[PDB]
Amino acid sequence: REGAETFADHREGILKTAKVLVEDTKVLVQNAAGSQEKLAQAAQSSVATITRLADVVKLGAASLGAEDPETQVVLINAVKDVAKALGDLISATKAAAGKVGDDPAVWQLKNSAKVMVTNVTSLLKTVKAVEDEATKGTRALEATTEHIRQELAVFCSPEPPAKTSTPEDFIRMTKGITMATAKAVAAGNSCRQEDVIATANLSRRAIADMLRACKEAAFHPEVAPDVRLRALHYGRECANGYLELLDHVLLTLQKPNPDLKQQLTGHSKRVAGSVTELIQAAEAMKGTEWVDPEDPTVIAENELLGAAAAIEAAAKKLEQLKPRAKPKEADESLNFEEQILEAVKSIAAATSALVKAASAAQRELVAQGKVGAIPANALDDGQWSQGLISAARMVAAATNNLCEAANAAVQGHASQEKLISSAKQVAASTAQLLVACKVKADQDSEAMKRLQAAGNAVKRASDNLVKAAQKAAA
């Protein structure tokens, strides 16, 4: 929360937007009939609705503040699911088009429209929960359980996903889920609304990636399809038990009696055994032995040095770009490119500050020897470190891509699509690199403090680039 702002404005704004969404889907229903013009009109109208929706929900989460990250996260996941299901309806319409109601495809389309209606209701309830600290818990739990129910629904659909996930990342998901349900039972003991919602968000991230990655990994071709049949089977039951634990979570919060508590505990360990079934299937399916190439430390400082050098070089090779008044290369002579270039240079400086703060945080981490004498810490921090290194190499790539964005803006780009794509992916890349940093980080350590300072610097860089780009070409 910054400045003297308050949330109620956002509350009502998203209220209006949710209404508008209701009529947007209602109209697009019949817009399935007609020619492309009417349907596209209502499509783009919905587009604008969800756009201002995203904006106002962003500012509402900002209104919520850092104090309770859980509320922002849960509502943003809600609006995320809303948007994705919107896209689901959009794609189906794009398919289920030019066919009158009798078509099974458009029949499914109507059903999906009703499903989106339910999703909108869910989002309404999410807003309700956003209003009151009094009872966020049960409603977050609901959102959670119907959420996972519809991922189940996706799972019952035999479909080809993008990739087939690695069994090792998948089994990391498995163990994360076991510790997750450990925390879940812990919170059930706690009977604390804030702990409830935090655990809920923990679920909607962890178990979601769990079950999906189960799907992709099983869907790997070369492995014996019986292996994946067993994997999908066991994942079905694990989802079932996850749901059952969730249900008993609801009951326990309503019914603090110990009977439901011990029931939930035992059910959780049943589910843990099922998770071990997934684990055994996963180790069965993986046909390879060695995973960790190099120790997390040495690679971490290779990352530190390389990223520091890369971003200082990026700042320098951006400084050698100057705001120039030539229209032959810079196809638009508007001073907005001047403003953008100055902002981009500031962004380079912010990214340099970011790599320095990350360097300091990493140095502190390796100074404590957080990589751990235990081999378990060796491997887990190895994968942490390698992911963070990928993150840093790709943010170096993003900063460079910013460098070529600036150089081409000097050369003239005039179709700001590539430039803004680059800027946005810089923002997201920085985000994920910070995330990799924040892994298992003692919150009140000064390393995290200056690291988050530099992260905020780059976030202001992201805001500045966003505002310039929307300003750019009006």
From Swiss-Prot:
Sequence positions bearing N6-acetyllysine: K26, K110
Region (Helical bundle R11) residue spans: 1-135
Sequence ranges assigned to domain I/LWEQ in this UniProt record: 288-474
Residues in the signal sequence: none
Residues recorded with modification Phosphoserine: S35
Residue segments, region Helical bundle R13: 295-474
Region feature (Helical bundle R12): 136-289
TM segment ranges: none
Subcellular location: Cell projection, Ruffle membrane; Cytoplasm, Cytoskeleton; Cell surface; Cell junction, Focal adhesion
Oligomer and partners: Part of a complex composed of THSD1, PTK2/FAK1, TLN1 and VCL. Interacts with THSD1; this promotes interaction with PTK2/FAK1 and VCL. Interacts with NRAP and LAYN. Interacts with SYNM. Interacts with ITGB1; the interaction is prevented by competitive binding of ITGB1BP1. Binds with high affinity to VCL and with low affinity to integrins. Interacts with APBB1IP; this inhibits VCL binding. Interacts with PTK2/FAK1. Interacts with PIP5K1C. Interacts with F-actin. Interacts with SVEP1.
Purpose: High molecular weight cytoskeletal protein concentrated at regions of cell-matrix and cell-cell contacts. Involved in connections of major cytoskeletal structures to the plasma membrane. With KANK1 co-organize the assembly of cortical microtubule stabilizing complexes (CMSCs) positioned to control microtubule-actin crosstalk at focal adhesions (FAs) rims.
Comment field on protein domains: Consists of an N-terminal FERM domain linked via a short unstructured region to a large flexible C-terminal rod which contains 13 amphipathic helical bundles (R1-R13). The rod begins with a five-helix bundle (R1) followed by three four-helix bundles (R2-R4). These are followed by a series of eight five-helix bundles (R5-R7 and R9-R13) in which the N- and C-termini are positioned at opposite ends of the bundle, creating a linear chain. The four-helix bundle R8 does not disrupt the chain because it is inserted into a loop in the R7 five-helix bundle.
Name under which the protein is recorded: Talin-1
Taxonomic lineage of the native organism: Eukaryota, Metazoa, Chordata, Craniata, Vertebrata
Gene name of this polypeptide: Tln1
